[PDB]
Design a protein around this motif. Structure first.
Motif, mmCIF file in Angstrom:
data_model
loop_
_atom_site.group_PDB
_atom_site.id
_atom_site.type_symbol
_atom_site.label_atom_id
_atom_site.label_comp_id
_atom_site.label_asym_id
_atom_site.label_seq_id
_atom_site.Cartn_x
_atom_site.Cartn_y
_atom_site.Cartn_z
ATOM 1 N N UNK A 152 0.823 -1.207 0.000
ATOM 2 C CA UNK A 152 0.000 0.000 0.000
ATOM 3 C C UNK A 152 0.860 1.261 0.000
ATOM 4 N N UNK A 153 1.897 1.297 0.842
ATOM 5 C CA UNK A 153 2.811 2.430 0.819
ATOM 6 C C UNK A 153 3.477 2.609 -0.534
ATOM 7 N N UNK A 154 3.907 1.505 -1.148
ATOM 8 C CA UNK A 154 4.489 1.590 -2.484
ATOM 9 C C UNK A 154 3.502 2.209 -3.473
ATOM 10 N N UNK A 155 2.244 1.749 -3.452
ATOM 11 C CA UNK A 155 1.233 2.276 -4.370
ATOM 12 C C UNK A 155 1.018 3.770 -4.158
ATOM 13 N N UNK A 156 0.882 4.183 -2.901
ATOM 14 C CA UNK A 156 0.717 5.605 -2.605
ATOM 15 C C UNK A 156 1.890 6.431 -3.141
ATOM 16 N N UNK A 157 3.107 5.881 -3.093
ATOM 17 C CA UNK A 157 4.269 6.602 -3.617
ATOM 18 C C UNK A 157 4.273 6.652 -5.141
ATOM 19 N N UNK A 158 3.968 5.528 -5.803
ATOM 20 C CA UNK A 158 3.957 5.528 -7.263
ATOM 21 C C UNK A 158 2.859 6.435 -7.799
ATOM 22 N N UNK A 159 1.668 6.392 -7.190
ATOM 23 C CA UNK A 159 0.564 7.199 -7.702
ATOM 24 C C UNK A 159 0.827 8.683 -7.475
ATOM 25 N N UNK A 160 1.541 9.021 -6.402
ATOM 26 C CA UNK A 160 1.979 10.400 -6.203
ATOM 27 C C UNK A 160 3.007 10.812 -7.255
ATOM 28 N N UNK A 161 3.963 9.931 -7.571
ATOM 29 C CA UNK A 161 4.985 10.283 -8.553
ATOM 30 C C UNK A 161 4.369 10.517 -9.923
ATOM 31 N N UNK A 162 3.382 9.694 -10.289
ATOM 32 C CA UNK A 162 2.729 9.799 -11.586
ATOM 33 C C UNK A 162 1.792 10.995 -11.619
ATOM 34 N N UNK A 163 1.229 11.368 -10.468
ATOM 35 C CA UNK A 163 0.441 12.594 -10.395
ATOM 36 C C UNK A 163 1.323 13.819 -10.611
ATOM 37 N N UNK A 164 2.532 13.810 -10.048
ATOM 38 C CA UNK A 164 3.447 14.930 -10.269
ATOM 39 C C UNK A 164 3.882 14.985 -11.727
ATOM 40 N N UNK A 165 4.233 13.835 -12.303
ATOM 41 C CA UNK A 165 4.800 13.777 -13.648
ATOM 42 C C UNK A 165 4.151 12.625 -14.397
ATOM 43 N N UNK A 166 3.063 12.894 -15.125
ATOM 44 C CA UNK A 166 2.414 11.825 -15.902
ATOM 45 C C UNK A 166 3.320 11.189 -16.939
ATOM 46 N N UNK A 167 4.416 11.847 -17.317
ATOM 47 C CA UNK A 167 5.333 11.338 -18.329
ATOM 48 C C UNK A 167 6.508 10.572 -17.725
ATOM 49 N N UNK A 168 6.425 10.200 -16.452
ATOM 50 C CA UNK A 168 7.531 9.573 -15.727
ATOM 51 C C UNK A 168 7.533 8.077 -16.038
#
Ligand SMILES: O=C(O)CCCCOc1ccccc1[C@@H](NS(=O)(=O)c1ccc2[nH]c(=O)ccc2c1)C(=O)N(CC(=O)O)Cc1cccs1
Lengths: 698, 14
Positions: free
Chosen positions: A91-107
């Motif tokens: 769950x923590x991993x998912x919260x981090x990935x979804x935050x990273x993709x929210x910041x940069x959809x092209x990541x």
């Protein structure tokens, strides 16, 4: 101070990390942080190498520092997700990935890391979509390409399969040439057309990851025993496994620790997993001379210290590159002899493993170059199973003559003979022999239970259970933790199989099937008019792919029948309904090979070149059925077709399996342990005489 | 089955 200073240290460290100079990278990152304490990139980059060194909490601390400095630092969020995933905090991993993709959809990297969560969660369609987004954003992305390829293998999507294999091999070749970690996992390399040198190199480079995690411990070499005096003449063997519990490996060898000769051996079992409460864990804890829960000692340095203090002579790696492994323990060499055994079908490729326990059929001396280890031969097969202890209710069977077939309506049970004593109209058929219940009142009630879907009935005080309802009757019997108490009824009707046709089965994961294999199976079905193929939904989303390709090959849809995954006991028991098992040549059935043979079902196999592609023939050789082993695809097909068309031959061969599962050494855990002990002593005498490991092929 | 590996991102300083 000039900004070029800290920037130059950080960027030079990145290069050192790429080259594999992890210790140098750490120094440069920390010097960059001395020069520029609020250096977000250096915090996050440092945390990446600390993660790689197994210092996970310290990595988390620096990721959070980086993000405090730069709240929209997407690299840091995605890198932190990778660390939380490793810590099992999905769950923590998912919260981090979804935050990273929210910041940069092209990541691109974040999309690919997210995809790895879906892949591990069983959500293959979403994994595929995220890997494809990653490759759209970063077309040259070996991790995403190779993990996408395995997603497609899992669901038997063979779109452009030939070109996929080309690129996989090209990627590995480039990474090996450039001294990088291959993006193909060692355990998956067996599925793709890579050279043996590439497969061994993949394994060696994954093992080198363990070195990075132990070198930070700065431990000296261990002093090893050179005699048996401290152990009163007994050889101390240590079995290291994450799978002392409800796991296939325990289903194979749970009897072996307790069968060791206590006069000459002292058995230490080192569990890498906590107690899951099953009878499998109870049994090994009760029967081993010593049981050590290393899951309570997460530091590999402290855990290896514990092994060494126990004075282990031979340490047995039962994980290889599988979930739950702590190969860092073997990299530290707490024992003078360290052997691969049973749990991992392939080489470690690593310097810290001396031997792989195998046999001449599985690993002929002419292919020793596929293994980094020295070969140590068991006399028959290295494979073993606990089926005689776990499933004795399948030692005998009876059938109902609904008209005589041995596999349309089947009864098994401990009290089955006692039950048949009460039914005066039963007929005994000799092809041991097989009792046949006529179509009488009792038989009608049994069939009514199956058709009506009832759970069980009682006749003459005997409980007769519906084979589909075992978990409702006794969950411990369904799992194999206990022997079923009741008489169990198993029928082709339960699984939609035809009453008047040949059933070919294969119960392996669908990723072990490739186009060449399905084409071979298609050739067989086309030659046996009364015949279907019985496969498993593992996963279900692979079903329509297999159906589509089969029809492209000329097989109508009604020729392939899928069943869901079943609990262990039902899975083995329902193998009695097949006529013949068709083994997968790419990667054989291993546990599932033992399962079908225990049910009395002949298995047709074509041994390849890898260890994983030759196990089934090793099992059939030990069993004594050399006629089921094909030298090429033509023979494989001809054998299966003869079995499906010459019913007298089929009866003969099935009788051979039914009888020799008992009389051959294949399921004899007592004989296996004795021969295993002779092999350990050959290893020990060799070392005690001052020799480095050598092949034990006699 | 084992856990799928992931990809760490190296941040270039500019
Ligand atoms: O040696 C080999 O041949 C390959 C071994 C690969 C590793 O497997 C793992 C790993 C970790 C935890 C458990 C397992 C499996 N246990 S098991 O004793 O092998 C079993 C139990 C019940 C079953 N019921 C069926 O209907 C068909 C098969 C079957 C197998 C498992 O429970 N599986 C099913 C699932 O997870 O839903 C995996 C499968 C293996 C083969 C087909 S599915």
């Amino acid at each position: 101070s000039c900004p070029t200073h800290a920037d130059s240290l950080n960027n030079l460290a990145n290069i050192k990390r790429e080259q594999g100079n992890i210790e140098e990278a750490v120094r440069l990152y920390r010097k960059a942080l001395e020069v520029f304490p609020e250096f977000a990139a250096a915090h996050s980059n440092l945390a990446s190498v600390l993660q790689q060194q197994g210092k996970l909490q310290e990595a988390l601390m620096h990721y959070k520092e980086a993000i405090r400095i730069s709240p929209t630092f997407a690299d840091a969020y995605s890198n932190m997700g990778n660390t939380l995933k490793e810590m099992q905090d999905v769950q923590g991993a998912l919260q981090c990935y979804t935050r990273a993709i929210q910041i940069n959809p092209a990541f691109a990297d974040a999309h690919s890391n997210l995809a790895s969560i879906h892949k591990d969660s069983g959500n293959i369609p979403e994994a595929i979509a995220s890997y494809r987004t990653a490759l759209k954003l970063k077309p040259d992305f070996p991790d995403a390409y190779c993990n996408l390829a395995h997603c497609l293998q899992i669901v038997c999507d063979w779109t452009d399969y030939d070109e996929r294999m080309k690129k996989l091999v090209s990627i590995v070749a480039d990474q090996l040439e450039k001294n990088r970690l291959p993006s193909v996992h060692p355990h998956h390399s067996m599925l793709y057309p890579l050279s043996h040198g590439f497969r061994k190199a993949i394994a060696e480079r994954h093992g080198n990851l363990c070195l990075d995690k132990i070198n930070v411990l700065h431990k000296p070499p261990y002093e090893h025993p050179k005699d048996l005096k401290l152990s009163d003449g007994r050889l101390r063997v240590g079995y290291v496994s994450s799978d002392f519990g409800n796991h296939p490996t325990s289903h194979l060898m749970q009897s072996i620790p307790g069968m060791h000769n206590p006069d000459k051996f002292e058995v230490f079992c080192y569990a890498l997993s906590p107690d899951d409460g099953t009878n499998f864990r109870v049994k090994v804890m009760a029967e081993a001379n010593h049981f050590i829960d290393l899951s309570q000692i997460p530091c590999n340095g402290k855990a290896a210290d514990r092994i060494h203090q126990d004075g282990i002579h031979i340490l047995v790696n039962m994980n290889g590159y599988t979930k739950g492994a702590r190969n860092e323990l073997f990299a530290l060499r707490p024992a003078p002899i360290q052997a691969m055994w049973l749990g991992y079908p392939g080489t470690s490729g690593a310097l810290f493993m001396d031997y792989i326990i195998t046999d001449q059929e599985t690993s002929p001396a002419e292919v020793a170059e596929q293994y980094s280890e020295k070969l140590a031969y068991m006399p028959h097969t290295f494979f073993i199973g606990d089926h005689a202890n776990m499933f004795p209710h399948l030692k005998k069977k009876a059938v109902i003559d609904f008209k005589i077939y041995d596999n349309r309506i089947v009864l098994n049970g401990i009290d089955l003979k006692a039950f048949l004593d009460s039914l005066p109209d039963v007929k005994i058929v000799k092809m041991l022999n097989m009792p046949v219940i006529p179509m009488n009142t009792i038989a009608e009630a049994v069939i009514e239970m199956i058709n009506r879907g009832q759970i069980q009935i009682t006749i003459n005080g005997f409980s007769i259970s519906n084979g589909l309802a075992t978990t409702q009757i006794n969950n411990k019997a369904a799992t194999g933790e206990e022997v079923p108490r009741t008489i169990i009824v198993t029928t082709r009707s339960q699984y939609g199989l035809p009453e008047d046709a040949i059933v070919y089965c294969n119960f392996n994961q669908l990723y072990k099937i490739d186009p060449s294999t399905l084409q071979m199976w298609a050739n067989i079905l086309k030659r046996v008019p009364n015949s279907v193929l019985w496969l498993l939904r593992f996963p279900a989303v692979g079903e329509p792919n297999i159906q589509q390709y089969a029809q492209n090959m000329g097989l109508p849809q009604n020729r392939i029948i899928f069943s869901p995954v079943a609990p262990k006991e039902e899975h083995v028991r329902r193998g009695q309904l097949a006529d013949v098992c068709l083994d997968t040549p790419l990667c054989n059935g291993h546990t599932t090979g033992m399962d079908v043979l225990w049910a009395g079902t002949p298995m047709v196999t074509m041994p390849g070149e890898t260890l994983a592609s030759r196990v089934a023939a090793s099992q059939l050789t030990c069993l004594g059925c050399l006629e089921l082993i094909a030298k090429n695809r033509q023979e494989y097909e001809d054998i299966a077709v003869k079995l499906g068309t010459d019913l007298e031959y089929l009866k003969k061969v099935r009788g051979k399996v039914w009888k020799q599962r008992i009389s051959s050494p294949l399921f004899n855990t007592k004989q296996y342990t004795m021969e295993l002990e002779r092999l350990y002593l050959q290893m020990w005498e060799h070392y005690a005489a001052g020799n480095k490991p050598d092949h034990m092929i006699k | 089955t084992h856990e799928t590996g992931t990809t760490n991102t190296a941040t270039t300083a500019t």
